[PDB]
Design a protein around this ligand. Sequence first.
Ligand SMILES: Cc1oc(C)c(S(N)(=O)=O)c1C(=O)O
Ligand code: NA
Ligand SMILES: [Zn+2]
Ligand SMILES: [Zn+2]
Length: 221
Amino acid sequence: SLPDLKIEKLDEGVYVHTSFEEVNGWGVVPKHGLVVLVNAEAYLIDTPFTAKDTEKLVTWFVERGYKIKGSISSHFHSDSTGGIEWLNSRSIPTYASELTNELLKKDGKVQATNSFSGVNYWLVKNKIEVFYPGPGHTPDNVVVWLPERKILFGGCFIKPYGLGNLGDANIEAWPKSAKLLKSKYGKAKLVVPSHSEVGDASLLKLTLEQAVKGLNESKKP
Ligand SMILES: Cc1oc(C)c(S(N)(=O)=O)c1C(=O)O
Ligand code: NA
Ligand SMILES: [Zn+2]
Ligand SMILES: [Zn+2]
């Protein structure tokens, strides 16, 4: 009864995948991830919520002649990681930061088979970069940068109009983290949030404004 998985071309070699979940209070929430094509290899930037939609996504690309080389999950929540177990079962390399894999284990979830540490990580040299801005939406949240098309996948860190689910947030750190991201990716042409429409570098400033207001709200009784 949920909207079908969507796959829409965003730019040369870049697709947005949109999967849907009902979230109590938030309604029917779209989740955007990317598929990035390097040569004839496909990289999932976040998995759909479900194994079934992860399989539909993979099959769509494989039928068109792309080889699934890996997934990277931007944070531990199921809107980024729901398909890791299914990918693992198909011997598709899954990636997450050491911190994301720690928070997956803490949450009783299947871990990524491959991990990385530190602040900047090249999943694919000169094509797909992982950057940790610091804690915000979650302690582990990372962004994914595509240097060639100047596309930033913000995941659930980019929150231009409201912060959404604060359950795992570090509201004290989020402003400092958003200042760092804003300083690093002003050159972004496209910024792709998890749960709202694609925009431009202005989404980094709007996110900073929301983080500052969230921290203020957290200090009220
Ligand atoms: C709107 C929304 O729905 C869900 C299911 C999430 S998350 N990434 O916290 O699970 C959020 C969010 O704030 O990212
Ligand atoms: Na794997
Ligand atoms: Zn989340
Ligand atoms: Zn989310």
